[PDB]
Amino acid sequence: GRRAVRVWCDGCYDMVHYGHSNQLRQARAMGDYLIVGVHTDEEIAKHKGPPVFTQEERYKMVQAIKWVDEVVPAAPYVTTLETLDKYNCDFCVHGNDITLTVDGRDTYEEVKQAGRYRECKRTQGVSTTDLVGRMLLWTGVSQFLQTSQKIIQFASGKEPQPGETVIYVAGAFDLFHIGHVDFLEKVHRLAERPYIIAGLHFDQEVNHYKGKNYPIMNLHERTLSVLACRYVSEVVIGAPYAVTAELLSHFKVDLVCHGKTEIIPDRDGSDPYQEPKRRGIFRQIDSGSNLTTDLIVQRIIT
Ligand SMILES: Nc1ccn([C@@H]2O[C@H](COP(=O)(O)O)[C@@H](O)[C@H]2O)c(=O)n1
């Protein structure tokens, strides 16, 4: 009936960003199903420094990316034909980095010789070193070039259907991380057919209430980061800090959630959730995670 083409990727996925997401999207577009091998903390420490995020954090983050069908924990550092056969994958997909042994032989010679290796395009605008750099520091630093096409590639493109519960969440969603995934995952359980709209605050607003040099990622980068998450149906690309009556009617919102993090008051001292609270449609959800963008900055610099 086809047959199905099963695609393999592997990696560390330590500090996942929209570059990793875009690479996984590309890999999935080359077949029908995507399996991602993720290395253990130990295996990574053998080859380079130990990772910032624990293997179980990294596993969970990768599984939350909507193009990924399954995560294989404890994948070997280098892709082999044996691993591809074990998971019945036709080929693996990696970036175009030079990957040579000390001798000048390709790290992936085996897989490449068997014709089971594919390259995907490198993602413009981000890398893990760039993001580290931003964290060691509002007018914006990213050279990401957002386009209608990148949004189309990342967006599910679906409108709310009859029977679907529209649920609005809002925030910075900066350095979109496992705390956000845990939040969104719980929100997604609140209805049988959830349609989650994530409202992303403007860069200048985030800087105002989060301070310092925040946000690390600009509105356009955070747009792609949130759209990659399997729990998200739509994003408001520049949402007001106050959850307004206009927003609630425009999107026909059924429920509004916020996590157990602190809600900073609005410019005028008001509760930015006052309207949905008055309507009786506000629900606080405990994500069970204490991870914040501020604490990631701390784990990554230290
Ligand atoms: N660890 C975390 C981090 C964020 N969140 C929720 O995710 C949403 C977005 O958070 P930020 O604006 O801080 O990015 C908020 O509703 C916040 O309460 C959570 O519930 N648990």
Side-chain angles (χ1 to χ4, degrees), residues 170-174 177 179-180 183 209-210 257-261 285 287 289-291:
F173 296 99
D174 189 21
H177 55 74
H180 295 127
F183 171 68
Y209 73 86
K210 211 81 66 155
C257 307
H258 185 90
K260 251 94 186 188
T261 65
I285 289 287
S287 74
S289 169
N290 34 53
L291 188 68

Short mmCIF file of all heavy atoms in Angstrom, two decimals, residues 170-174 177 179-180 183 209-210 257-261 285 287 289-291, ligand 1:
data_model
loop_
_atom_site.label_atom_id
_atom_site.label_comp_id
_atom_site.label_asym_id
_atom_site.label_seq_id
_atom_site.Cartn_x
_atom_site.Cartn_y
_atom_site.Cartn_z
N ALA A 170 -1.10 32.37 27.25
CA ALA A 170 -0.31 33.52 26.83
C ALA A 170 0.96 33.59 27.61
O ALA A 170 1.02 33.12 28.73
CB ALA A 170 -1.11 34.83 27.06
N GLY A 171 1.99 34.22 27.03
CA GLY A 171 3.21 34.49 27.77
C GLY A 171 4.35 34.90 26.88
O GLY A 171 4.14 35.25 25.71
N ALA A 172 5.58 34.86 27.42
CA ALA A 172 6.78 35.07 26.63
C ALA A 172 7.12 33.86 25.72
O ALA A 172 7.45 34.02 24.54
CB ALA A 172 7.96 35.40 27.54
N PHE A 173 7.03 32.67 26.28
CA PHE A 173 7.53 31.45 25.66
C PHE A 173 8.93 31.61 25.05
O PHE A 173 9.20 31.21 23.91
CB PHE A 173 6.52 30.89 24.66
CG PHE A 173 5.23 30.47 25.27
CD1 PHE A 173 4.11 31.30 25.24
CD2 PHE A 173 5.10 29.20 25.85
CE1 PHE A 173 2.91 30.89 25.82
CE2 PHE A 173 3.92 28.80 26.42
CZ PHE A 173 2.82 29.63 26.40
N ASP A 174 9.82 32.16 25.85
CA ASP A 174 11.17 32.47 25.43
C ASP A 174 12.07 31.26 25.72
O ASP A 174 11.92 30.63 26.77
CB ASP A 174 11.64 33.70 26.20
CG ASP A 174 12.98 34.26 25.70
OD1 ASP A 174 13.38 33.99 24.55
OD2 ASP A 174 13.63 34.95 26.49
N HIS A 177 10.91 25.62 26.29
CA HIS A 177 11.64 24.60 27.03
C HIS A 177 10.67 23.62 27.66
O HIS A 177 9.45 23.73 27.51
CB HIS A 177 12.53 25.27 28.10
CG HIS A 177 11.77 26.19 29.03
ND1 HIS A 177 10.94 25.71 30.01
CD2 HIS A 177 11.72 27.54 29.11
CE1 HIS A 177 10.41 26.73 30.67
NE2 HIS A 177 10.87 27.85 30.14
N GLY A 179 9.66 23.12 30.67
CA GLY A 179 8.62 23.69 31.54
C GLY A 179 7.35 24.07 30.77
O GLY A 179 6.23 23.80 31.23
N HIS A 180 7.53 24.67 29.59
CA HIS A 180 6.42 25.06 28.71
C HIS A 180 5.75 23.81 28.17
O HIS A 180 4.53 23.74 28.13
CB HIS A 180 6.92 25.89 27.52
CG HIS A 180 7.50 27.22 27.90
ND1 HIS A 180 8.76 27.63 27.48
CD2 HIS A 180 6.99 28.25 28.61
CE1 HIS A 180 8.99 28.85 27.94
NE2 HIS A 180 7.94 29.25 28.64
N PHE A 183 3.64 22.35 30.86
CA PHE A 183 2.42 23.15 30.98
C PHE A 183 1.41 22.80 29.89
O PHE A 183 0.25 22.46 30.16
CB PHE A 183 2.78 24.64 30.96
CG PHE A 183 1.58 25.55 30.86
CD1 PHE A 183 0.68 25.65 31.92
CD2 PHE A 183 1.37 26.32 29.73
CE1 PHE A 183 -0.39 26.48 31.84
CE2 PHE A 183 0.30 27.17 29.66
CZ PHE A 183 -0.59 27.26 30.72
N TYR A 209 8.56 43.57 31.29
CA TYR A 209 8.19 42.83 32.50
C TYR A 209 9.19 41.75 32.94
O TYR A 209 9.20 41.36 34.11
CB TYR A 209 6.76 42.28 32.44
CG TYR A 209 6.48 41.11 31.52
CD1 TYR A 209 6.67 39.79 31.95
CD2 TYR A 209 5.97 41.30 30.25
CE1 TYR A 209 6.39 38.70 31.11
CE2 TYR A 209 5.68 40.22 29.39
CZ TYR A 209 5.89 38.92 29.83
OH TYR A 209 5.60 37.85 29.01
N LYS A 210 10.03 41.27 32.03
CA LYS A 210 11.01 40.25 32.37
C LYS A 210 12.37 40.91 32.60
O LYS A 210 13.24 40.34 33.23
CB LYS A 210 11.07 39.16 31.29
CG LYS A 210 11.42 37.76 31.79
CD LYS A 210 10.20 36.97 32.40
CE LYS A 210 9.10 36.62 31.35
NZ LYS A 210 8.21 35.40 31.67
N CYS A 257 -5.93 29.43 30.31
CA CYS A 257 -5.10 28.87 31.40
C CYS A 257 -3.80 29.58 31.59
O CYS A 257 -3.21 30.09 30.65
CB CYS A 257 -4.79 27.40 31.15
SG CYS A 257 -6.25 26.37 30.85
N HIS A 258 -3.34 29.57 32.83
CA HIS A 258 -2.00 30.03 33.16
C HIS A 258 -1.44 29.03 34.12
O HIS A 258 -2.21 28.34 34.81
CB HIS A 258 -2.03 31.42 33.83
CG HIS A 258 -0.68 32.00 34.08
ND1 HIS A 258 -0.02 32.80 33.17
CD2 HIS A 258 0.13 31.93 35.17
CE1 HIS A 258 1.13 33.20 33.68
NE2 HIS A 258 1.25 32.66 34.89
N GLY A 259 -0.11 28.94 34.18
CA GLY A 259 0.53 27.98 35.04
C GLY A 259 0.65 28.49 36.46
O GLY A 259 0.08 29.53 36.83
N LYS A 260 1.40 27.77 37.28
CA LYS A 260 1.59 28.17 38.66
C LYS A 260 2.79 29.11 38.81
O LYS A 260 3.33 29.22 39.88
CB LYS A 260 1.68 26.95 39.59
CG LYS A 260 0.47 26.76 40.49
CD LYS A 260 -0.57 25.80 39.89
CE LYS A 260 -1.88 25.71 40.71
NZ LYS A 260 -2.83 24.64 40.25
N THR A 261 3.18 29.82 37.76
CA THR A 261 4.23 30.84 37.88
C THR A 261 3.59 32.17 38.23
O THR A 261 2.38 32.36 38.11
CB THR A 261 5.04 31.00 36.58
OG1 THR A 261 4.19 31.51 35.54
CG2 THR A 261 5.65 29.65 36.18
N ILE A 285 -3.29 25.90 36.02
CA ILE A 285 -2.82 24.54 35.78
C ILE A 285 -1.40 24.45 36.33
O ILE A 285 -0.55 25.26 36.00
CB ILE A 285 -2.82 24.21 34.28
CG1 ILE A 285 -4.24 24.06 33.74
CG2 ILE A 285 -2.03 22.93 34.00
CD1 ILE A 285 -4.94 22.74 34.19
N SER A 287 2.00 22.88 36.06
CA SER A 287 2.79 22.12 35.09
C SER A 287 3.65 21.03 35.74
O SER A 287 4.09 20.11 35.07
CB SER A 287 3.74 23.02 34.30
OG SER A 287 4.83 23.42 35.11
N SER A 289 6.56 21.55 36.74
CA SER A 289 7.94 21.93 36.48
C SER A 289 8.22 23.31 37.02
O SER A 289 7.40 24.20 36.92
CB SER A 289 8.24 21.93 34.98
OG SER A 289 9.51 22.54 34.75
N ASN A 290 9.42 23.47 37.55
CA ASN A 290 9.89 24.75 38.04
C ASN A 290 10.84 25.41 37.04
O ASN A 290 11.39 26.46 37.33
CB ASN A 290 10.57 24.56 39.40
CG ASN A 290 11.30 23.24 39.50
OD1 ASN A 290 12.13 22.91 38.64
ND2 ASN A 290 10.97 22.45 40.52
N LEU A 291 11.02 24.81 35.87
CA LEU A 291 11.99 25.35 34.91
C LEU A 291 11.43 26.65 34.32
O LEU A 291 10.27 26.70 33.89
CB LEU A 291 12.33 24.34 33.81
CG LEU A 291 13.48 24.69 32.83
CD1 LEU A 291 14.85 24.71 33.52
CD2 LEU A 291 13.52 23.75 31.65
N1 LIG B 1 7.73 25.73 34.48
C1 LIG B 1 6.73 26.40 33.92
C2 LIG B 1 6.97 27.43 33.02
C3 LIG B 1 5.92 28.11 32.43
N2 LIG B 1 4.60 27.73 32.71
C4 LIG B 1 3.44 28.40 32.12
O1 LIG B 1 3.68 28.59 30.68
C5 LIG B 1 3.06 29.80 30.29
C6 LIG B 1 4.14 30.71 29.67
O2 LIG B 1 5.16 31.06 30.60
P1 LIG B 1 6.13 32.32 30.31
O3 LIG B 1 5.42 33.57 29.90
O4 LIG B 1 6.97 32.56 31.57
O5 LIG B 1 7.05 31.83 29.16
C7 LIG B 1 2.49 30.43 31.57
O6 LIG B 1 1.13 30.07 31.68
C8 LIG B 1 3.31 29.80 32.68
O7 LIG B 1 2.62 29.78 33.94
C9 LIG B 1 4.36 26.67 33.63
O8 LIG B 1 3.22 26.32 33.91
N3 LIG B 1 5.42 26.02 34.22
#
